[PDB]
Design a protein around this ligand. Structure first.
Ligand code: SAH
Lengths: 484, 19
């Protein structure tokens, strides 16, 4: 394979992935077209440019020694390859809830700042994508240090995974399970973004003199870039800068071996000692795996950005796009009430797997969406108008019983309609999971599409229950609650 | 609570043509 052939293929890939969106009905065909080009390039390349002789666990002692010399906690835990989560930390002593058991000084981190000060610095100061997008900058920082045998961060890089379960690694038929879902468009975008960025930077590295001393000048494969962005998206963190006035992105060694469980965030940055600090989420007996709570992300976010599906995710949600129509004769009034309430005229809201499934902001939007002209005027005019807007997000103070019956009827109908846009039913998804033997990645996709429908179905039932509750208040002429 | 809580794997925008 000549370098001119790869240059021809990456030029074609850049042009294909820089074209505008071909329309939502053409995105699957575009996706498969892009996959075909990427796979042709990948097949003509030698995988990861830099591979290490040892096994992943052969390098954990160097990680501990390296972290210890720079002031990190290295006692009380060990690395174990767990079946469910991959490698993680296991307690070697009893750890009490709220005990500070893990700390990582800033010097160990890989940050956008350390990327600026590295061999990548010259190209960083030149390229507008690197300057605007710290996550991509971290990805190239990781690659350049990976290919630098004397890098300060070699003990960390050598213990990183070599593969991930982000959708970038899925087979075409594994992604195909996501057809008709909300999530597959983000899968499409991630794939197109990653391919465009690889082709763009492949050419930029060839043309810019600032990249002449980078190891990537000698070898930069698609596998390199997919590994690097997947490393960053599944592990990156937001921390304050050294002076505390700005935020930056960072990879945090040792601590980022912790796997996820439900709970609360117990990891914070200590600016005074300039180190990341993690206190125990719960009691961990010796021999138990040490977990942290990553954050309140949905399973669609965990799958796409974190590479895993979390069963019993108590923060799971789906999107629902809503807006006041310009054909509404009350558009002007509704738009004004929403603007005074700090809510856009049209937006992408969330439905949660909870009761209620809607936030204060979505409740406020739905109330205004269904207001009569007389109700709208009471939220626009006179000495009580601002008090009325103040309570719009509060379930305990409806605008009127009729307003509630209308909004919950609408939400019931909209969520029912959304359910009817999926290729499969909830019962069919459960049968697939019960009667087929599937890979992990395939299970992630099917459970994702099942999860979207289960959230919608629960919203339908919740809206139906709320409709009957408020229709009873209406028929019984109950006094309307007054905030006082 | 924590002055600088750290979300593991916080979602960022990778769309270079929008940002
Ligand atoms: N609860 C969970 N279930 C399955 N995989 C999990 C998980 N929590 C974390 N992970 C995995 O761990 C990654 C986050 S970094 C955590 C350490 C990682 N397991 C490693 O071996 O380096 C995620 O991409 C996912 O692959």
């Amino acid at each position: 394979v000549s370098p001119k052939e790869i240059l021809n293929l990456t030029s074609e890939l850049l042009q294909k992935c820089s074209s505008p969106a071909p329309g939502p009905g053409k995105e699957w065909e575009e996706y498969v077209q892009i996959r075909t080009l990427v796979e042709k390039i990948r097949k003509k390349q030698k995988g990861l440019s830099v591979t290490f002789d040892g096994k992943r666990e052969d390098y954990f002692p160097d990680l501990m020694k390296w972290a210890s010399e720079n002031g990190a906690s290295v006692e009380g835990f060990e690395m174990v390859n767990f079946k469910e989560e991959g490698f993680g930390l296991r307690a070697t002593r009893d750890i009490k809830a709220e005990e500070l058991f893990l700390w990582v000084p800033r010097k160990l981190l890989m940050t956008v700042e350390s990327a600026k000060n590295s061999v990548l610095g010259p190209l960083y100061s030149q390229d507008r994508i690197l300057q605007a997008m710290g996550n991509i900058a971290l990805a190239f920082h990781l690659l350049c240090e990976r290919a630098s045998p004397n890098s300060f961060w070699q003990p960390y890089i050598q213990t990183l995974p070599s593969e991930y379960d982000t959708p970038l690694y899925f087979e075409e038929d594994e992604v195909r399970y996501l057809q008709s879902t909300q999530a597959i468009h983000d899968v499409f975008s991630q794939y197109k973004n990653t391919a465009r960025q690889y082709a763009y930077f492949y050419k930029v590295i060839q043309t810019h003199p600032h990249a002449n001393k980078l190891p990537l000048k000698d070898s930069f494969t698609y596998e390199d870039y997919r590994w690097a962005v997947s490393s960053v998206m599944t592990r990156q963190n937001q921390i304050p800068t050294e002076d505390g006035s700005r935020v930056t992105l960072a990879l945090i060694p040792l601590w980022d071996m912790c796997n996820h469980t439900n709970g609360l965030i117990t990891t914070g940055y200590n600016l005074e000692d300039d180190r990341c600090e993690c206190v125990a989420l719960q009691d961990f007996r010796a021999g138990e795996q040490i977990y942290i709570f990553y954050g309140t992300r949905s399973n669609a976010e965990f799958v796409i950005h974190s590479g895993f599906f979390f069963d019993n995710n108590s923060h799971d949600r789906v999107k629902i796009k809503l807006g006041v129509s310009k054909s509404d004769r009350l558009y002007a009034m509704k738009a004004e009430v929403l603007a005074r309430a700090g809510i856009p005229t049209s937006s992408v809201f969330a439905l949660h797997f909870t009761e209620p499934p809607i936030s204060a902001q979505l409740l406020a939007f739905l109330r205004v969406f269904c207001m009569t002209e007389e109700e709208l005027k009471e939220h626009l005019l006179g000495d009580s108008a601002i008090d009325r807007i103040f309570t719009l997000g509060n379930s305990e103070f409806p605008v009127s019983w009729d307003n509630e019956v209308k909004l919950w009827t609408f939400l019931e109908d909209r969520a029912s309609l959304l359910l009817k846009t999926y290729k499969t039913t909830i019962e069919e998804d459960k049968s697939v999971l019960k009667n087929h033997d599937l890979s992990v990645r395939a299970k992630m996709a099917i459970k994702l599409r099942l999860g979207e429908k289960e959230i919608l179905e629960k919203a339908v039932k919740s809206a139906a229950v709320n409709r009957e509750y408020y229709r009873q208040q209406m028929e019984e002429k109950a006094p309307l609650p007054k905030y006082e | 609570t924590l002055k600088y809580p750290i979300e593991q794997g916080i979602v960022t925008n990778w769309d270079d043509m929008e940002k």
